[PDB]
Amino acid sequence: APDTSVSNKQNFSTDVIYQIFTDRFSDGNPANNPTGAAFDGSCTNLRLYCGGDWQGIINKINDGYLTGMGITAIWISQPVENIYSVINYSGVNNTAYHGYWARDFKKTNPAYGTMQDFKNLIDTAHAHNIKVIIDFAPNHTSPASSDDPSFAENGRLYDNGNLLGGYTNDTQNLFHHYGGTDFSTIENGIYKNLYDLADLNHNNSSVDVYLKDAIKMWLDLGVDGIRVDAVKNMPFGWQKSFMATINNYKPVFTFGEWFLGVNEISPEYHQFANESGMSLLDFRFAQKARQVFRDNTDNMYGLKAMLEGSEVDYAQVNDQVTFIDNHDMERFHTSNGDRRKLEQALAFTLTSRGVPAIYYGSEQYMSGGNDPDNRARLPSFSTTTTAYQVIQKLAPLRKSNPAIAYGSTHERWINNDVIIYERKFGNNVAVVAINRNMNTPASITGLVTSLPRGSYNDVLGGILNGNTLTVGAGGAASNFTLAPGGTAVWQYTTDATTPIIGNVGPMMAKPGVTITIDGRGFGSGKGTVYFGTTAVTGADIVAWEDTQIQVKIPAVPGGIYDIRVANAAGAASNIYDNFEVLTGDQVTVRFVINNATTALGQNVFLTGNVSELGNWDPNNAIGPMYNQVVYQYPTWYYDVSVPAGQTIEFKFLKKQGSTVTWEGGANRTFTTPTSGTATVNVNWQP
Amino acid sequence: APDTSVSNKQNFSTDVIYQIFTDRFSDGNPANNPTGAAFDGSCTNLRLYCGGDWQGIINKINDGYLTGMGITAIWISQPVENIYSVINYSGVNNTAYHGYWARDFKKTNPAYGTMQDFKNLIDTAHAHNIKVIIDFAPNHTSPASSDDPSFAENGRLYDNGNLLGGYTNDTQNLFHHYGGTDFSTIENGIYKNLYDLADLNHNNSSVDVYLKDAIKMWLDLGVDGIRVDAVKNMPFGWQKSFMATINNYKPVFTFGEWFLGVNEISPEYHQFANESGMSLLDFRFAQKARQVFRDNTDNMYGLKAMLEGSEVDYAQVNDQVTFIDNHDMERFHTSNGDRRKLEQALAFTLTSRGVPAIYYGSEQYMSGGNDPDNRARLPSFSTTTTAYQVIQKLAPLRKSNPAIAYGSTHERWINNDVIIYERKFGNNVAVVAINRNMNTPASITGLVTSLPRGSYNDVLGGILNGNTLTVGAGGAASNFTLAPGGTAVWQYTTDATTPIIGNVGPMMAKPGVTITIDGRGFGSGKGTVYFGTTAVTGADIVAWEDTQIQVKIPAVPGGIYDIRVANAAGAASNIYDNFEVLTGDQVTVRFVINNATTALGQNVFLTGNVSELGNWDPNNAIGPMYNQVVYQYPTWYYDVSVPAGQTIEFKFLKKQGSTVTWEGGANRTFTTPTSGTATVNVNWQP
Numbered sequence A, B: 001a002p003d004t005s006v007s008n009k010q011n012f013s014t015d016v017i018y019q020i021f022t023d024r025f026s027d028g029n030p031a032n033n034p035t036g037a038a039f040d041g042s043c044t045n046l047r048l049y050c051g052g053d054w055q056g057i058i059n060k061i062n063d064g065y066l067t068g069m070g071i072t073a074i075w076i077s078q079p080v081e082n083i084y085s086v087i088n089y090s091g092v093n094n095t096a097y098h099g100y101w102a103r104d105f106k107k108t109n110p111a112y113g114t115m116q117d118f119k120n121l122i123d124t125a126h127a128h129n130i131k132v133i134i135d136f137a138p139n140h141t142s143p144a145s146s147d148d149p150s151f152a153e154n155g156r157l158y159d160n161g162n163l164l165g166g167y168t169n170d171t172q173n174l175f176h177h178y179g180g181t182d183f184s185t186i187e188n189g190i191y192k193n194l195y196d197l198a199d200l201n202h203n204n205s206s207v208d209v210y211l212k213d214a215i216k217m218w219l220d221l222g223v224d225g226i227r228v229d230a231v232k233n234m235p236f237g238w239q240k241s242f243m244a245t246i247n248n249y250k251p252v253f254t255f256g257e258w259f260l261g262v263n264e265i266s267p268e269y270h271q272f273a274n275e276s277g278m279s280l281l282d283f284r285f286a287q288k289a290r291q292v293f294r295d296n297t298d299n300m301y302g303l304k305a306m307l308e309g310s311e312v313d314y315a316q317v318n319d320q321v322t323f324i325d326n327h328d329m330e331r332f333h334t335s336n337g338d339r340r341k342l343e344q345a346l347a348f349t350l351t352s353r354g355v356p357a358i359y360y361g362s363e364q365y366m367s368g369g370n371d372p373d374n375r376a377r378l379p380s381f382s383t384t385t386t387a388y389q390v391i392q393k394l395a396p397l398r399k400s401n402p403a404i405a406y407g408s409t410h411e412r413w414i415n416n417d418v419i420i421y422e423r424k425f426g427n428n429v430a431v432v433a434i435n436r437n438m439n440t441p442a443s444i445t446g447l448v449t450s451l452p453r454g455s456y457n458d459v460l461g462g463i464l465n466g467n468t469l470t471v472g473a474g475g476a477a478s479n480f481t482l483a484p485g486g487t488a489v490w491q492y493t494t495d496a497t498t499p500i501i502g503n504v505g506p507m508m509a510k511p512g513v514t515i516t517i518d519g520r521g522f523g524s525g526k527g528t529v530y531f532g533t534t535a536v537t538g539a540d541i542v543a544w545e546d547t548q549i550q551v552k553i554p555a556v557p558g559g560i561y562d563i564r565v566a567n568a569a570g571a572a573s574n575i576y577d578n579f580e581v582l583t584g585d586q587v588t589v590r591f592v593i594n595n596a597t598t599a600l601g602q603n604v605f606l607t608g609n610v611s612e613l614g615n616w617d618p619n620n621a622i623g624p625m626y627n628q629v630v631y632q633y634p635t636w637y638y639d640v641s642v643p644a645g646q647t648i649e650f651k652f653l654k655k656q657g658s659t660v661t662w663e664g665g666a667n668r669t670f671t672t673p674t675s676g677t678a679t680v681n682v683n684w685q686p
Ligand SMILES: C[C@H]1O[C@H](O[C@H]2[C@H](O)[C@@H](O)[C@@H](O[C@H]3[C@H](O)[C@@H](O)[C@H](O)O[C@@H]3CO)O[C@@H]2CO)[C@H](O)[C@@H](O)[C@@H]1N[C@H]1C=C(CO)[C@@H](O)[C@H](O)[C@H]1O
Pocket: A098, A100, A194, A195, A197, A229, A230, A231, A232, A233, A257, A258, A259, A327, A328, A371
């Protein structure tokens, strides 16, 4: 089918996402509204339920509010049954309106709707070519105190009605009981509790398989994307087996939230987008967009350096979800901030690389500080605001112009307040110029672009003071003055003769899984797909057409591969690297090693004979291991995704700068379980 | 040996060439100086012999003038025996001092020296790590009038003293007798005479074989490169069979002169570079450099556009020879003009991509107009000029820092008067910042770089008012003020672990010849070289070390191939593409089709079953064929290089944009000659 079908659950860079807090969007059904102290239909107390639901979203798809805007993906609040208690916190009553305090991951939150109401949402979203992404927060259940079993619902977890257990009297260790995080360390934030949320224990096999059974249930019900919550606060090894579970079952675009501060460039964050099997919410993009476009704490050079840098650091930059604000940040639009700032910042995000996500109500210039003030009910469904209009005009360019969906970003002109950048994919190009200065016009002299000769009309129709572009000989454009606050988008589209790959999804799966390669120039005749130098042709290509091919991963050795396409005429595409073929189905195993004594700067790592363990290469070893919380030094521990039901060989080692110290002895061996969890507890062999 | 060795004849990106007009450099042997009419020892008359010779260049390698400047290659006037005539042109006497009026391509010009002095030049140069590039001028012989046999030497051509023929009464048709070129079309500039020069006819098997035998004997005297003259004015197809003759016998770096004027961009120019097997003097670069640093008829965004654009248009940009002036244009330094512009532009060229050439005497701020004023004798052998010191500081960096020699160019900061660009290859980095404004200081803010945090000396030692750079977190540099006329070079080197290809020479050749791949990170142990999915290893990798491997071209089908290296440890490199494997040795065949009547913009083309003929792909067919000078429309003719000694199958087609009207009938067949030429003459088949 084409790369732009609503059935393409694997790649979303042709989409624009509208992030909906279900409770604050629309109350389509008042008979499902909570009662008593859990409810506030005036929505003046923002920690209470206001009554918004799935029928209210079906209604704004149907009446065209969402479709009118060009929105093609909806990201909604976690669908799962939540705790019913009203919790008092320092006098303030609080409810589970946000969907984040779960108790049964196999049932719906009935304030949102029934199971039949979720199905009706998927079906009318799909009938209108909209994809449905759900939040999923497998890190925890609900507010709990083991000391006080009567507080809230004591973190209790049920499997489709059947109690599994609570936080007080956790004889099964379904939950972590280490106290709360102080956020000092990644380890500390993983194993300790977030605030007061009862931390699930993913190393318990019942928690492991129930959470994996539950996500399969939501995939069976037709969801197309998953935003997983607090990715920083779960074991990365467990997350990779969770990701292999959805990728080997029904791969859908999955991305996670790892929060990043203002000028924080974090290595682990990038490693996580590059290696977990899910992409990330692009906080680096988001924080620099607000520094340049909102707060003027950085300029266009900062903007350029971030777009250039991120194209290298994320192995698949076209998979990162970009945004200018969301539910954890103060709204972009301030009380005294010019609306042009919001409008340009949205235009930027809509024509930039990635998968743009728009927080509900941006188009209605909502302002408000941090939680809960950034989650007010949206004030109006006016369809004629300037912001509604810039998204209406630009969001469809992601489906029609493959340069916006998949192209590289080239800065063609710049100064402190102006950047004009070019997105290019094959022969398709889009050019956008923006002048963030609202007093001073900009004299553009010497712009050259890849546009063929012509007089390009600004796709924004002049609503942000854009203009026509007259491109002469050799893509050189005639000089113009960009208006103060001006933003213009100029574009050109054509057929590609060369295969050009713009995106592949999933990026990690075992042999036999159908991968989806999207781009242009594949031609209509079944060509060749290369995993390294292995070639799939014929029947292993389950589907071929100019924009999309679907093909089964061949039975190659686990490891990571470059993908390449050849059309039926033998012309070959660009290389799409970092594809991970897995040795098979995964299981997460805890590795505990006692008496691994280390000097300062020395850490224990794990390596082994399968690609998941680095294939005996010390540079690709699993680690640094942890040694503070679940076990303390010199015991080190780590949860590592590993091939299920196989005997693997492995050894530990210590690394200090360039020096590697392997443990002596023979190779340790271990037969992994087929499902669940396992722990290997061993002692340093000198 | 390593990439930077003086024995690397295939690639020159690590070199700095010094273009010497042999006659105007140094007279080291007066006894071989011309007498009386052909000579002027005061060299007051720039059209007569002044005396400069190969012995004088040997003295300048020996006494330290050239090696002290960091020059690593020398390009000298054509070595070949020229006519002895003093020609009159308007009562202005004129001699062959420039070496361009050949008589015999197998003897030396006695004013320069003997074959014995030419061996001494090769040997003193190599002994001092300087490569020797000779001009070769195969388009023509010398001024000739067929009407008047006594003018000059009637363009007579000798074969090692044995007369072959003169222009008057050329019965064995050695020359073209179509009149002179008005430069109206490429076809007209090729087959008609350039000025009064008896134009050689490459379709004559005698001239085709003699010219190839002569180039081979200078490859046999140990020349390291060849600048071939007037590449525009000879048939592509013949120059390709000539390139295949050099590359299948003793590959050395060869590049042509295809003159190009200001703001001029020819597609045929970039097609020649990309498809001939030779590269080109980079007139695109040189013309924009003079506009920005000499003449002020463009600014930094223009420079920026040229750098960005040449990087995608030139398939192998690292092989283009750059310069800011030469013998066919006015010298860059203007009389009583600002020296700092010369110094700045010299520093610009020295740190930019390609292979830089310096016109002799630039370091002595030689002024002069067009021919012959730009070839006055070098007036000083001063080693302390700032232009001398600038070349001495920066020329070495092309051997030491691979970012300068092979790296990509990326603008990092810019405005009308300032560019700071960064060269990047692996983690080796060079950042050069130039302020062409000689009056205004520039404040740089927002410079983000790829250098590690630290403070960086200007390698020019501040002689061009450059400064010390301090780099903080994430490559962001501290605010600074680039002086008026400030030029500053800051750099970072570190060993590459993983293999990176920076250059490949030759780029076109039959199976069995040894190519040179240069870069970093290849390691000390043989790994694999791919030509397509064809892995080449062991005995065929003739040599392998970290910066250079040499390997024999596999017995693959004729076609263009991507080259990729995987070091012993399996880490694979970037792809170097557009490599052409010839089906075999080459002969230029003239194809002539009669009665091929076309429509509006319908052109005739040739295609056949070898890769040389596009392998039956209409989108790759040879053409559009010619039809004015040698044969007239509706007869079309084209000189195509084809594999020697086999039955090619061909057909002709007409292309109306995307319509291909094919000949009917059956596929034609012809057995090519093994050496020499042939002409196939046929009529359109409906
Ligand atoms: C449960 C919580 O989940 C999401 O936020 C995550 C982040 O994705 C995760 O990376 C981490 O980020 C925090 C960051 O480390 C810290 O420096 C910054 O100051 O705050 C970030 C956000 O809290 O932590 C949280 C996981 O705890 C959602 O985006 C959050 O909205 C969501 N919040 C819940 C939790 C509480 C209390 O149970 C409610 O007050 C809140 O309304 C609800 O949304």
